[PDB]
Amino acid sequence: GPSVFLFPPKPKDTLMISRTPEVTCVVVDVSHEDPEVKFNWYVDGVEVHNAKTKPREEQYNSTYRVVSVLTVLHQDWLNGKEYKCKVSNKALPAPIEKTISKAKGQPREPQVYTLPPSRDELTKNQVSLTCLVKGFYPSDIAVEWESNGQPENNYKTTPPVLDSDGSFFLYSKLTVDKSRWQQGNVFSCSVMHEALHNHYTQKSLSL
């Protein structure tokens, strides 16, 4: 029979008020003999009817996949409200309820430290600009780089690593042409996190 997977909003969407966070209920292995699926959405046990449900899309494995999308209020997600998708279908003798919420825990403010390339790396044509982000909790975070206000996306960020004090840390590595660094261009690490003031901080880095 069908199975259901419930997905949280992207952290950046929940932290920046202009963006649009969504909880997504995904139903897979919907059969052709019983293809009708009903969604019921609940926020802290209270039914809500503003979800937008997409039409069944057939998969290459001859099963249907039907998706319902619930737009959420930033502050509801951040305050730990619970989001329940209930999925009814004639092949389910009982519906499937999945419930999700923001990761729990006392929030801790990330400290953001930018680190220039090592001297040893200056023999290479590209150098590594490092953004250390430590002391944060919970682990939901967004880390981006830019220069002159424009995205610098040739970077890679480690997963959050649990540190010895219960907090998380990560590193972000931006790779740039050495000529850009030694000519004094300014790069900046931007970090978004619920424990930050206005959910946003930016640290710069230059020669």
Next chain:
Amino acid sequence: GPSVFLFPPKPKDTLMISRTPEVTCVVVDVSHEDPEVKFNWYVDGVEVHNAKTKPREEQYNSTYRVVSVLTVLHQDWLNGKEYKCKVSNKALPAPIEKTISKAKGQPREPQVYTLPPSRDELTKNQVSLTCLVKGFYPSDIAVEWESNGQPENNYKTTPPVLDSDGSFFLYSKLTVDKSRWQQGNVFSCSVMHEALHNHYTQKSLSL
């Protein structure tokens, strides 16, 4: 029926000649009614006879657990030889075979860069010393810190992260009390990887 699990040597064991790398073949869910277990080992399909098999040990669930350990040669493992454990037991319709070997792929040599704390961190009781290891392949690697002849305790290392060129990088973060950093103590990141000369390199930093 019995099930078999085959574990590889630790990367560091294969890289330092002082150590003794081993492949371990564990058999669980061995019954009282059919308790005899026979191991046969093969390297590249050629039977070898120098494994050390321990006598069975009954578990709290009233099944036996049986372990056989094959010492491997460092160069055999690094040269990609295949280690097959075959397990026979009369409760099996056929012997179970497990095979393992080293991660495949063109080796690429890590570059190792130490980075001091951000000046912004010098207001904290503790500071973060960072070890960047980039450009290595495969991902099997060991990273340690030491100072004054003794390993450091309070470090954490990220998982390998796939970089944009197909190689991996990681960061290791050593946290030291600020007094120790300000007193000029030298801290050292040691990296062990098959693509390094002598499978080892070290970088050090001080105030």
